[PDB]
Write a protein that binds this ligand. Structure first.
Ligand code: AX7
Ligand code: 2CH
Ligand code: 2CH
Lengths: 188, 184
């Protein structure tokens, strides 16, 4: 990840005007949609939290959790720490990132700070559901000037995406003012 | 450097009891001595600053500044960013200032958590030669014991002065004005 940290603008875009900031959300959304479109009648939920973090949930299969034979860490950690631009770029430029994977009847949790895992991916409990949740806090050391998520930039993009992803339910939630949208195109 | 950031304790030592914190200084000093023991009447100055940073100055030849043919960046940057070594210290420092005097030129570079902020750059002229590294330990890594104890540094630098007989070692505390000069 040091290549991304050295020149953030090359990977995410302009880190001052707010375009790069919103590309962080859209990069995570692209991966969640990729997963959701591969399943049956899946759903993604994008939530803007009151602390200006954004979470993206899907109810797909979950990011693989088994140990990568070569790397010697969970497949999820390899995806988060090895260099669409990739979710690893979002991880590298986030001061905090929370990963929650529900898979094979088990809840897996891991926390990152500036791309560095604070502990190995850990099975913390049990679940009947499946899916992946990524919540990230953009790094205020990288993202300057424009540091808050505009609802309409996310809402407009998710509406456009809905028509290219048939059968995928897309929900947007703003916990700052309670505003919410539901985009669900069922064509084809 | 992510391997170091992931498990700081395995590279520098215990990051809670003050052991690792002081090892950060000793790692930089090892390189400075190494350098300086390849020459003759060299001196190393270790300074504890009021803002809880430590600087190590030497009057050696200076770390090589030219572009590394394989890596495509300055040889100094390769030393600070590739794998114990000063790269470990760089990785676990929230800020690190590098100043190299070599071949008639002063070179400067700043790092934050091991990430270079710009390329090694010529900032002026000089008759002198040497290397200076000033680092601010990351308080995200180093907990409980965050401030440098003078006597922990003094003890180790004394031991080093006997082993490295030709090298002068000065220790300076800018918080309370305390100082020592170890030379065998
Ligand atoms: N605050 C902060 N910024 C960082 C950048 C890279 C790795 C660790 C870091 N901690
Ligand atoms: O399904 C997910 C969700 C977020 C990031 C990456 C993946 Cl694969
Ligand atoms: O002489 C040197 C060399 C490497 C790191 C620090 C110093 Cl002071």
């Amino acid at each position: 990840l040091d290549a991304v940290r050295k020149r953030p603008g090359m990977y995410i875009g302009d880190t001052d005007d707010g375009t790069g900031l919103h590309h962080m959300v859209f990069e995570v959304v692209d991966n969640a949609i990729d997963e959701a479109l591969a399943g049956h009648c899946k759903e993604i939920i994008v939530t803007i939290h009151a602390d200006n973090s954004v979470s993206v949930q899907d109810d797909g299969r979950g990011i693989p959790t088994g140990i990568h034979p070569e790397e010697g860490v969970s497949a999820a950690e390899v995806i988060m720490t090895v260099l669409g631009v990739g979710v690893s770029v979002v991880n590298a430029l986030s001061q905090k990132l929370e990963l929650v994977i529900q898979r094979e009847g088990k809840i897996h949790r891991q926390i990152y700070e500036h791309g560095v895992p604070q502990a190995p991916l850990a099975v913390t409990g049990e679940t009947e559901k499946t899916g992946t949740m990524v919540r990230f806090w953009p790094s205020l050391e990288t993202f300057t000037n424009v540091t808050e998520f505009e609802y309409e930039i996310l809402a407009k993009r998710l509406r456009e995406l809905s028509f290219l992803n048939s059968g995928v339910s897309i929900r947007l939630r703003d916990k700052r003012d309670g505003k919410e949208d539901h985009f669900h195109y069922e064509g084809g």
